[PDB]
Amino acid sequence: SLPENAPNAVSNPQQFITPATALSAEEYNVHEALGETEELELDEFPVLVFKGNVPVDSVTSIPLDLATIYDFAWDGEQNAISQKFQRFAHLIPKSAGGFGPVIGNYTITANLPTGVAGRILHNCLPGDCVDLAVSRIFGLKSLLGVAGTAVSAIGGPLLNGLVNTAAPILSGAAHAIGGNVVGGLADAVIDIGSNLLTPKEKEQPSANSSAISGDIPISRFVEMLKYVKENYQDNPVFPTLLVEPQNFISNAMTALKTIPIEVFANMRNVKVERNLFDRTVVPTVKEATLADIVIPNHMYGYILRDFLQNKRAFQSGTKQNVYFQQFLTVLSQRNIRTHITLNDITSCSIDSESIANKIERVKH
Amino acid sequence: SLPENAPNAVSNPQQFITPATALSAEEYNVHEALGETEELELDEFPVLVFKGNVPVDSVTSIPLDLATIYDFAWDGEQNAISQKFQRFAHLIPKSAGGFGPVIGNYTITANLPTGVAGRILHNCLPGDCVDLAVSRIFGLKSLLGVAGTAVSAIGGPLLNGLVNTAAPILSGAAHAIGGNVVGGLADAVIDIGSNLLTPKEKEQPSANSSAISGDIPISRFVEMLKYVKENYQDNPVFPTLLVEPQNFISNAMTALKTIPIEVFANMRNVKVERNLFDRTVVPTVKEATLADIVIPNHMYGYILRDFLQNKRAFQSGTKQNVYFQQFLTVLSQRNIRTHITLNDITSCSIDSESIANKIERVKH
Amino acid sequence: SLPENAPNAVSNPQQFITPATALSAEEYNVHEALGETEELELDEFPVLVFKGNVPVDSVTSIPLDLATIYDFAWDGEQNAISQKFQRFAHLIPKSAGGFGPVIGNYTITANLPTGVAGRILHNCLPGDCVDLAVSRIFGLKSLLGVAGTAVSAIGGPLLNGLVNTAAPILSGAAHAIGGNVVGGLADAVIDIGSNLLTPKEKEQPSANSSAISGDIPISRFVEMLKYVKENYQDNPVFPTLLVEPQNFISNAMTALKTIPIEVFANMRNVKVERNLFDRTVVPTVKEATLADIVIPNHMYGYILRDFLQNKRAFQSGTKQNVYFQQFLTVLSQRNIRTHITLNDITSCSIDSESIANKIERVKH
Amino acid sequence: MQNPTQTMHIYDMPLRVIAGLSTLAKTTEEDDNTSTGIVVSEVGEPQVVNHPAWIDPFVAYQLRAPRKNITPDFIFGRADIGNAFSAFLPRRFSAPAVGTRLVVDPVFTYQQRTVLGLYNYFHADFYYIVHVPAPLGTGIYLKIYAPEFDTTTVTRGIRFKPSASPTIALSVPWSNDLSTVETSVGRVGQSGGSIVIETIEDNSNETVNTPL
């Protein structure tokens, strides 16, 4: 499933704000003829990966590490995506895209009243290139400058980021008082491969809800998706979702901050192999929060270069100069391991000021 | 009526947020070739089952006990659904769904101005599995984790939870000043079995109103629906509607609480048998409020287990720890009967604190 | 004109909230082959019958007595409907509906900003059954319990109760700056009998405006509509419009009260006979307000019974107990006439309290 | 492959009535009591019943509508007893007063209680033959129906005059919201196989020994 549509040579500006990621998928190195498709009903539950408030005019990272992921719409220990990583050793992507092999989609949704109005920039970078993720988080670069970025305007008078399910019962709710159940069942049984409207979500459009969604790529060198958690700190595989709310004014023409959103995810694009029994080392889902980000050893000079080619990171009192003094301090620390964390570049101490942080770093 | 549409194998994500409840109906044990269809005009009045305010970010139970139900849109003693239980002994469901045999639909509606915006999660569990109902009420589990849950976004700029009737007169209101009566009559006489738009509710859509609706299942072991009120406290049959309003912010970006909704219901999917005269023991519709919930004797360890596999129910000061100390106290009481009520786990006293409530319970 | 469409046996719940009023029209006793159709251009002016504020969660009576009716959109003595009753003795309805012969339609309209949102219940009972009118006015019964009630949600993001005319000039306004005149002329000359959209009100829908309308029935025993004003106080013929605004919250989630609406009416479904000259007794249109309601002598025990089967009318401090003590006082008065007025059951004095009002009434 | 079903045979039917009653009609064409006035039936005209424990066929009034009776077979153990060791067993009752009510509870033979005692759950259908011998000055008018929930509830049944049709016969199928009740317990509120006899009038002589 989850096809590979061929675009045109030139992208039409009325649909896309960036060029296309590629004109063909990138299915080398992935061993697609290897597993066995395993469609159980547990795969059809989505996962509430992120829920909460998100600051306006700042890129927010959502580390989308599906092996150790937590579900905020469920109180249990495992969920629909992480139990798939408990049961099997090998997960094999079905198809691919312009970034890498792709294993799922995400969905951003936000129920807003009509008195606020803004827009959302979103992109999901594979994690083979985490520099482009981290440079966007630190305010050094914007999301509009990398291919694959979409813009969706949640306001509104606008029916964009919204979820409408219409329950999967065999009755279809044919005796409903004062209105029609739109797109539920006993309208159309639209296939997962096809992409159509039912017939009733063509004149409704409150229940049609043009979604804010992308895909979940992994990385373009692995053959399958065997998770070890020591190897993926050295060569990361799982992607990172980048979200940026831009304008968001109120009816008093006052710029808002910290809007509420929530992100759903599913992984319905994989094949399985090597079913495992009574194992000891498990992928250890962290309770109640998240994963963080891993910056490996060979990514340091790429993060270092992007601060240096930024005129705003040198002047004091700005947000980029805070991260850059926190970045130079962590490089002068003592690391027994071969990677640092984004949280280490947020909860660190401070010195004075920029140049002496670099002279002490070329000696260490 | 009220058909049984066959879905696809994999549910399309643009319509459904959960997997399908089943791929076929579950019409074993129900004796469909037994009654006689009885279509009187009183069946075409819906019943306002619930009306009032409902708290945000908390699952609200609506016990949908149709034998003893009250109508808030009518002041009389009986109504359209409960008089059907007065007149006959046996009610026979026509068709079935993924949960059980199904006897009707509900409809949630809410007239909101454009300055507030949220979403609604709703599901209607059969009552053969009341543990999944009660675990969701107590905040132990969410509605997104069980099959059949729909999500509808009432805001809004959105035309979702709304009722438009357009009166059933034979004139059709053909002399109306300044506008067309949409979908009333002298447009189309759309059948109850078919699911179409008239021709005038295709370009109107203010009067089309994509509904928030599900179905009313009963239970998968009974042969018909003979109501005794002593047997249904031991093996419950009637379902429970679970409603959860999620976000609901205002134009000041302030989270609301306690939104107003109201719920309609109908039972137009049954056959009748065994017409009864001058009876003494009647199903006793309770005036002006509701039914409550019955938790039978064989459901205690299922409620007990779900508190134990919840990390939030053990820490003090939270909402789940209040219910769990109220649950352990009621099990240490004296019950002459073989069931407890959800109201007994709300209006109970308190002790100190968790562990000593369980040591005194293993002795009783 | 104004046809008689045949509905299905079972009403579809996505369009209707009540059962159908009848499956056939009720054209006995009306002498349709009697008059002569008289289409003058004065008939194509609607009448603003009601204008003003209307309280929320209370049924508001609009006595729709077309012989003596006042127009609030015109300052003159007569209007489009009442001059028809000046000129002729006999008015003959063309066609009929489930209630009675029908002579016109009404239209409720309300221009609301997007920051408030509610719903409207409306029904127009013939006046052969004024008990069902008066029981709804006094809060004893709701509009959802009688056949023919429609529900329309004015909010909004919703384009429901709105009037768009697009002036009847022969030019069609073909030179209009920056937009198209929708449905005026030089689009389509849609017939009064047909029910179509032009072609331009199919993609506009701001100018399509799904209307809030019903019909104006009279009564099922008269042969024609000879108005005497003494006979219609004993056996009333003209209908009564019942309007109920339900929820109506603001952006501060605060329940409103007293919304503004206005009601249009027309009578374009009649035939005339017996043209009258230099008459003395005229139907006397009352200046600047309205008619009231007439409750005849044989309707007393029907109003009396509905208070008695209401548990809320006996407890003190409620609105229904105020009317019931005012109803029992008027029955103990001295009536030289054979009917009472609804205004007599509003502007009356008070006693103490309920039971002694009834013991003094069984003696008078 | 299913474990095989085994059959046992019973041979010649203990307590079989081999000389029946002459007042009970064998075919529907020889029965017109509904037509003139003798039987006032609200459940239809009587249909022909063939049963092995009674020698000749007889017409019976269907007090409940005939059905198929789903038998769930998922647990271990199943048996079709099926008219084996089956008999029409008689009992005498006095006719009640005009206000009161008589409930006849069903009975069954010793050999049916033994074989059905090897199992836990059952269902069955029932038949009744009511005979009121009416000597001379009999003006009784009776009423028979099936009880439903409690003591006062009345359903559709038959009314008849025993002076002109002394024997009446009935057919009571299994109607319950649970198939296969427990044998010794039953469901609360069930009908079972009970019938209800009620006296409407007593227009008899002074010489007739009443409570007949």
Author numbering:
A (entry chain A), B (entry chain A), C (entry chain A): 1 to 364
D (entry chain C): 1 to 212
The authors write:
Nora virus is a positive-sense, single-stranded RNA virus infecting different Drosophila species including Drosophila melanogaster and Drosophila simulans. Nora virus ORF4, situated at the 3′-terminal end of the genome, encodes a 931 amino acid-long polyprotein. The translated polyprotein is cleaved at two positions (264 aa and 515 aa) post-translationally by a virus-encoded protease to form the virion’s mature structural proteins VP4A (29 kDa), VP4B (28 kDa) and VP4C (48 kDa). The Nora virus capsid asymmetric unit is built from three subunits, a single copy each of VP4A, VP4B and VP4C.
